[PDB]
Write an enzyme that holds these catalytic residues in place. Structure first.
Site, PDB file in Angstrom:
ATOM      1  N   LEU A 118      -2.822   4.654  -0.354  1.00  0.00           N
ATOM      2  CA  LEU A 118      -4.277   4.225  -0.432  1.00  0.00           C
ATOM      3  C   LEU A 118      -4.675   2.890  -0.306  1.00  0.00           C
ATOM      4  CD1 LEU A 118      -7.182   5.249  -0.932  1.00  0.00           C
ATOM      5  CD2 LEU A 118      -7.045   5.156  -3.386  1.00  0.00           C
ATOM      6  N   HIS A 119      -4.650   2.635   1.064  1.00  0.00           N
ATOM      7  CA  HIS A 119      -4.632   1.327   1.699  1.00  0.00           C
ATOM      8  C   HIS A 119      -5.681   0.519   1.270  1.00  0.00           C
ATOM      9  CE1 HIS A 119      -1.233   2.632   4.220  1.00  0.00           C
ATOM     10  NE2 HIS A 119      -1.797   3.805   4.544  1.00  0.00           N
ATOM     11  N   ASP A 120      -6.959   0.671   1.711  1.00  0.00           N
ATOM     12  CA  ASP A 120      -7.941  -0.393   1.919  1.00  0.00           C
ATOM     13  C   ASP A 120      -8.394  -0.982   0.387  1.00  0.00           C
ATOM     14  OD1 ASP A 120      -7.364   0.045   4.566  1.00  0.00           O
ATOM     15  OD2 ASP A 120      -9.234   1.093   4.854  1.00  0.00           O
ATOM     16  N   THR A 133       0.838  -1.301  -0.242  1.00  0.00           N
ATOM     17  CA  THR A 133       0.152   0.125   0.085  1.00  0.00           C
ATOM     18  C   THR A 133       0.933   1.240   0.036  1.00  0.00           C
ATOM     19  OG1 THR A 133      -0.282  -0.069   2.450  1.00  0.00           O
ATOM     20  CG2 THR A 133      -1.953  -1.127   1.141  1.00  0.00           C
TER      21      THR A 133
END
Ligand SMILES: [Ca+2]
Ligand SMILES: [Ca+2]
Ligand SMILES: [Ca+2]
Ligand SMILES: [Ca+2]
Lengths: 326, 338, 333, 340
Positions: free
Chosen positions: D255-257, D205
């Site tokens: 931007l992880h999720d 990420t």
């Protein structure tokens, strides 16, 4: 005949009693005393040992080493009497001559190591150490002399097993104050006896009966010594009554020396003892597999007669001390 | 002018390189070497130090002390493989340490022999006395347990730790810390002045390339082509593992970086912080946990004093400066061996 | 005035005795029983509760919930669970569980660990002051409840058989079974703002012994009315007796859990002290240790501890217990 | 065709992005969203999920469950939760939560942490093989579920944004937020027999960055259709940007999720390795550390006495970043079209 031994302790009113027992006992041949942190800082315990010796006319004979000041990996954590006389008439410490020191500022925690190592090498089978304070000194020694572990026998006042603790809910002072030390010792291959856990010492009480026998044996010969030993013996007595519930206070550490003198008065069981170190509120807990190879003997109780035998031993010695002070 | 210092280490191929740097560096005045457990048992490390010295013609000059054999509260083939030590072994001069101590032979050496010698140096020190540590730090923890008051007069420069990159021998920790983390924890809270001079962060950017190798050959083959073979065998000895186990085309050289800090700290960046050493952790003991990120987030709520300097990276020029330093010394060693 | 309460337990021979006491006691108005893991798996404990009820002619009245099967963050540690006795008749004449009608279930396979939550929450909301729960097994169920109903914590009162304080432990050197089997649960509960009493620690229960004297009184009260019930309650009562003698040194075995219900019935027979209790969780050999500051008191509290019965308490307990057994014997006939 | 899945999350600006991806992706058939504590209290996260849905015209379709409020055995570390933007309109035009009709509730005060359990259990029983859950907050809800439905563990597949492996942590030196905020939960999950993928650790990420290039593509795809939506998604996307630059050193924020949902959509873009993962719980400064035996297995695979228990995605294959952003921008484009 008689047993060569060394004393590691933190006097301490009981340690003072144990020193008296070991020294004046013909059965034990005290080679040195090492002091450790505990009750007080190791510096005060060191002096308290020398005071014990000088009171009983032995401070010129037995070397006292000032040992380590704090636990291995943790932070640290003789009243009733006026020591001003015993202090100013204090002879030079034999330890200084052994070491090549001029004065006591030169004493270092590891001074006893070379002396212990001679004794251990000399030992036919194993050399005997009585420990009645934190066991930091011995852990330290063993980290420097790993191979000596198998030739050392240890007889300790430490632990609680089938009863709860004192200074913390389920642990006893001497263990919890540096539990890594004892853990280290126990896995070192040292021959270890818990000779005097709370289990026993809490049944070894300074009653007014015991007091009268002390007076009996000492006032005749030295009524000054009588006042001193009784003031000392009753010094933490109110706290023992109020804090802990003791009408009469226990006398811990001389029991350890008594084991080395006369082990026939003790029951013994071998087991595996684990010392709690990870525990947040329970470090120093002696957790056995009683109720992994065995690693200790535990003395859970005296045989019948043991209490009387202990007190006859103790009062004899006090009597003999009273005679020498005169 | 030049800095009085002591070396505590576990040679070890890198420790051998660090010893070479410190001794032959005019800037450092090595008073003694103490050895410790780690790579090998302290007994092998002790001999490996003496071999380093004897190879570089110094084993008659510098005393080597054999230190503690295990961690404070934890459990622990030559140690210097790739090379034949049989000659260096049998031509080994008597250890100056024995005369200092009053010993006849090496069987009499004990872990705490260096204590009195260190204490003279520390008392003598104008400000603080310097120790370079590139193995486990058990010896110094032990010293400090015996000489608490000396803590404030000792300065330590270490190859140890990982900070902004992950660990080596375990996921998030570096060998020297995790092998006895209570030691470092003890040291850091003792009031010792401590620098993490050479964490993995840096040493993993200090690589023995074929370029570096050619410069070594350049500087040494002219004077002693036997020494050339030796230093290169040693330097490439754990190289395949470094490639396969860890992903290094070219292996790092750790410990001499620590001595280089004490020689020339201008090539390093530095930041003060509070470092906590993980001891309770089951899979994470030896982790160097700093508050560097707390101090960016909210510096005003930090309720913990700094206790270490951390060197996270070399300044530009630092790598070249390091290798010029290192190759100079190797050159000078090659000249003496001849 | 009688007290609305719920029972959370792991029968268990003592839990069976406690259920008997609470149900047949007019002073306690048992709303439900939730079972938990411990002695046996929660599935066996669930049945063991229903057997207790059906034996005493109450399995058609009181809903039994089958609760959580393991500790919050630990593995379980551990017959039927109620050995010494033949349950084949009590089993096949077992009426439908009132819980199923409450829940909308057809059969017991549909029971889930969190079924009691909605029922407890009605009781707690209804409660004037606080609602009472007697816990004599692991306290996983209550920890779980409180993680789902945080705000209900301040309106729950708990009365437990758990802990050792001034004496050592049983299943481990310095800890008692119910705490050590899930210590995070009790830790959670104690810091939740729940009003908690250690009503029946080993300190007390180890002085509450099934002597042959107590046995004769049981026979006295029950054989006349139902000599089958007599055999059963006595077999159960003596079932872990040899182990208690040999493993632990008890000539006569303790009876733990009914003491907890007795606290809620008649607290005047107990001494009480407030203190701060810390539950050991980090400790390797000592997890589940109840560590209080009781001795530090020479100069915030989160629990009451009952360290001992007042004089008369033991007799009062046994009169209470034998009365109930007598009344049960009469109804079975 | 398309995968039935559920979303457990703590929106959260990234969770909002992940919800957008999963819902509007034809490849994923979102059954419900469960919210959990983390960023904000579970109550705010719950509303933040409903706002995401209502913004994208889906709040009347998908049930949102409000889950557990704190870790199993730890204190929370717990703004709207979705700042940079004014939600007053999305708030007052919010349709009734489908969850309430499912549950028999009149209003949202009746929602309880364990409401999703029965719904998940139907899905799991229904599942042919295993049922898919995307988790991008703390995993307390799933740990809780599994404590109530132990036997369902073997029929659940989890795809998570969580962990750091070959790089260091974020909120603490060597651990990532979602793990350390309740590490017993993940420890529980991993030893439950759940099939677990670390699909989106920091490892990945932190290489998925909202550049000004990415921003212009967003504008490209959305301004034509809905320039209001453009402002909103960009404000949100740049909201923790300065902190990411100053606190953490990111010129452009990660931007992880959505990466986690992207795994379930298109796993061919990810590398994968099986290993045994241990979660640090005892550690004082290191709780939440994901410690694998990946290095033991290169050193000496023959001494490993512990079965693998997770797949770890350490990196995207080449093309993966482009594929991710095309996926993400497509969805944003389609959302912009519906808002109009
Ligand atoms: Ca003592
Ligand atoms: Ca080294
Ligand atoms: Ca029970
Ligand atoms: Ca999230």
């Amino acid at each position: 005949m008689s047993i060569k031994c060394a004393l590691d302790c933190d006097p301490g009113h009981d340690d003072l009693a144990m020193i008296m027992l070991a020294v004046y006992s013909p059965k034990l041949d005290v080679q040195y005393i090492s002091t450790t942190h505990g009750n007080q800082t190791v510096n005060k315990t060191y002096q308290n040992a020398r005071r014990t010796l000088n009171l009983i006319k032995r401070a010129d004979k037995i070397p006292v080493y000032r040992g380590y000041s704090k636990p291995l990996t943790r932070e640290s954590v003789l009243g009733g009497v006026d020591w001003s006389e015993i202090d100013r008439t204090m002879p030079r410490n034999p330890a200084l001559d052994i070491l090549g020191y001029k004065d006591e500022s030169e004493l270092r925690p590891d001074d006893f190591f070379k002396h212990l190592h001679r004794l251990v090498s000399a030992a036919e089978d194993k050399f005997d150490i009585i420990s009645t304070g934190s066991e930091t000194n011995i852990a330290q020694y063993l980290l420097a002399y790993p191979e000596d572990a198998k030739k050392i026998r240890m007889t300790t006042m430490a632990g609680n097993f089938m009863i709860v603790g004192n200074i913390m809910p389920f642990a006893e002072f001497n263990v919890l104050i540096d539990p890594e030390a004892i853990s280290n010792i126990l896995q070192s291959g040292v021959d270890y006896t818990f000779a005097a856990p709370l289990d026993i010492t809490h049944t070894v009480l300074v009653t007014e009966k015991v007091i009268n026998d002390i007076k009996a044996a000492t006032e005749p010969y030295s009524p000054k010594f009588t006042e001193m030993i009784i003031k000392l013996l009753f010094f933490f007595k109110d706290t023992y009554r109020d804090v802990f519930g003791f009408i009469d206070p226990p006398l811990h550490d001389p029991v350890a020396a008594f084991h080395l003198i006369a082990p026939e008065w003790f029951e013994h069981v071998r087991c595996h003892v684990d010392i709690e170190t990870k525990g947040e509120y329970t470090y120093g807990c002696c957790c056995t597999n009683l109720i992994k190879p065995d690693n200790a003997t535990v003395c859970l109780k005296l045989k019948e007669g043991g209490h009387d035998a202990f007190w006859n031993q103790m009062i004899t010695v006090w009597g003999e001390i009273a005679k020498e002070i005169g």
